[PDB]
């Protein structure tokens with residue numbers, strides 16, 4: 008029960024017993040059951056909203072609220088998508104409707120009006136003249152300028168715009184300028200971008216300290232650490248560099264709680280440190296955005312990377328040589344270009360106006376569907392098409408597996424998300440105490 | 447004071463701090479000299495240099511370091527050219543080099559076994575005492591396993607049949623590991639994470655220790671990402687017996703690289719590096735971390751790899767893109783640059799007319815070589831094509847030294863930056879015991 012790792016103030020404000028968060032996994036892989044189990048142990052999970060329709064997100068919220076009815080910690084992810092700010096306002100209104108008091112903001116480059124509106128809800132000032140937030144944000148960042156934005160107060164450009172539209176009140180807009188754009192930050196390194204936490208984490212920790220003496224807020228902003236945390240040594244290293252809390256993703260996919268196919272959870276059980284690869288990202292494909300995926304038992308990383316090299320080498324979709332055109336339609340997708348396009352015009356016929364106009368966009372959405380298809384096939388059951396499975400994963404799982412090798416935890420069916428976190432947290436504190444003295 | 451006590455004694459160090467090699471002599475003789483006087487171990491950058499420049503550097507270091515001061519030599523592995531390896535080990539034995547940094551090896555080789563065998567002996571107590579030592583630089587489990595395990599008896603038995611080893615040296619070599627020590631290298635040419643890798647290799651060393659039961663313990667080093675007191679503190683906390691630093695050392699008075707590059711390097715940040723294709727194993731998608739701030743080299747080098755996988759022939763490149771390579775990337779035509787590579791070897795030009803892929807492969811490999819040479823040169827304004835190897839560690843170091851007099855590369859001395867790094871790492875570990883608890 009000791010749990011002396013991380014910042015004491017962070018645990019109080021979020022209602023935790025351990026300064027341990029479990030990051031989101033898309034399409035509900037970070038399930039309602041996952042959060043429920045973390046909430047009962049005083050740990051903070053984030054529901055995987057990305058990809059899901061509002062129907063499934065709304066259902067997951069009420070499901071959690073009726074089990075977690077004693078102030079237990081739970082949160083929701085909110086992934087930034089550029090042209091879909093219509094859904095951002097909907098999700099924040101839904102989060103305010105279902106009393107979600109913490110969100111994980113990811114893929115943001117700047118703070119937005121819906122994020123400002125979220126923090127503003129039930130915002131108030133105490134008798135002492137200090138701004139007390141009701142709803143909190145933990146921005147997951149990988150770059151200095153983004154971290155800087157979220158550590159700095161919200162842009163007046165947006166706060167003033169919001170008052171003209173009645174979304175904020177002058178009392179709220181003044182209180183928002185006296186607090187950071189996000190309540191806390193997470194530094195992401197090798198998530199399932201590709202920079203090391205060892206070179207990054209000391210910088211962001213100093214940047215937080217710089218922003219603290221500059222803006223002079225009431226309470227401290229806490230810096231989290233994510234990407235590569237799968238063992239007591241990994242977490243101990245993060246905490247030693249100055250992390251106020253830790254965060255894990257890759258491990259949590261290999262548990263009873265996570266919503267992914269059982270074969271995938273079994274493939275995940277036997278992965279090693281060198282069984283991952285950098286594939287192109289679905290959301291920001293054309294810009295060379297990478298995604299770390301599973302390599303053991305799947306051709307998806309090679310096949311996905313091959314689709315990117317052809318997008319850059321050819322401008323039109325029809326300019327692909329006959330020799331290579333046939334292999335994509337037969338074994339990658341298992342469907343021709345025209346029948347794939349016929350299904351994609353069915354949903355959103357609007358985009359077809361752009362596909363007819365621009366031959367690059369026509370090509371782009373076809374290859375983006377291979378990445379979607381791969382993710383969906385991994386989530387499905389009773390399917391022996393493991394060659395196209397896209398399973399987001401990092402070396403941290405491989406490191407975790409190696410650490411648990413020999414114990415009863417080798418099988419995923421004995422891995423409970425709360426007990427793996429509890430063990431990780433307790434061995435980390437045991438190692439720190441030990442290693443520091445054994446100098 | 448920090449690290450493994452036995453490692454410092456066997457290599458004659460005051461600090462368990464090594465400085466990795468930097469190709470084409472960038473890890474200069476002067477650097478090794480300055481590190482040797484502070485009780486730190488530097489490895490001379492032999493890669494790319496001809497034997498005359500390596501031989502000259504050796505005698506230069508011996509003329510200055512004769513008080514048993516620590517210095518070593520790098521040795522990379524090239525399968526196409528084994529004679530270069532043989533000659534270098536004979537040169538290292540000629541000039542009394544007692545420690546070597548083995549890189550890009552997948553298996554221990556006859557020249558490495560011959561190196562450890564020189565002046566090898568057994569004490570009165572019946573324990574094998576090595577004269578010449580190897581520190582293998584590995585990034586993979588199977589390679590680390592090989593070097594932790596004793597030398598393959600088949601290479602050792604074949605070496606006896608050719609008179610390279612004796613009957614008693616061959617027995618002594620089987621009772622000791624293939625390399626005296628290991629360095630786990632991550633991120634720096636690989637995509638590996640020191641946080642996920644280091645705990646494994648430390649356990650693998652322990653497994654190999656109880657298995658083979660050698661006399662003396664094998665020490666595990668840590669390289670890739672160490673540019674600050676908390677990076678090193680993290681490595682030492684994960685079980686590193688010593689740490690190694692490369693990117694930071696390139697930005698010091700002692701390193702042999704152009705002053706403009708040292709100025710470029712002084713202002714780099716954590717996000718100012720990029721993964722470009724490697725000179726060696728280019729076709730296989732092997733990556734190399736390079737400088738991004740001020741150079742177009744990472745983009746231009748990566749574009750050449752896309753062109754190689756796209757087409758089959760060098761002449762099949764469309765006219766629009768064919769012209770920009772011959773004028774912006776380099777200042778020679780495809781036929782003209784082929785003439786530049788006549789001097790090195792005519793027999794490889796035979797294979798080029800035979801295979802049209804090999805023809806374009808060696809052309810794109812020269813862009814990478816040209817980029818490296820242009821960075822080393824002075825009076826340079828060809829910054830656009832400079833290939834400067836670097837990692838986020840330099841950016842992290844710069845941010846740590848921001849505000850102090852060490853901000854300029856002229857105020858930075860390789861021994862004092864290492865001394866400070868190690869002094870503050872010690873301080874950080876000791877003080878955080880009281881801080882977090």
Ligand SMILES: Cc1cc2nc3c(=O)[nH]c(=O)nc-3n(C[C@H](O)[C@H](O)[C@H](O)COP(=O)(O)O)c2cc1C
Pocket residue numbers: 029030031032033034036055057084086111112113147195197198199233234235236237254255256257258260398399400401402403
């Ligand atoms: C299956 C999977 C799905 C993920 N999906 C998302 C996502 O939708 N949103 C997000 O913010 N992070 C996502 N992540 C990243 C994690 O939340 C976490 O920050 C990261 O994996 C930490 O790195 P680690 O895996 O090395 O511990 C995902 C990770 C995995 C393994």
Ligand SMILES: Cc1cc2nc3c(=O)[nH]c(=O)nc-3n(C[C@H](O)[C@H](O)[C@H](O)COP(=O)(O)O)c2cc1C
Pocket residue numbers: 465466467468469470472491493520522549550583631634669670671672673690691692693694696834835836837838839840
């Ligand atoms: C300029 C430069 C050149 C390098 N050349 C070599 C080389 O020839 N051989 C080698 O084994 N390592 C080489 N390295 C790797 C370093 O010796 C070292 O392993 C590593 O860079 C340490 O990590 P750091 O870059 O994060 O400080 C090079 C690194 C740099 C910065």
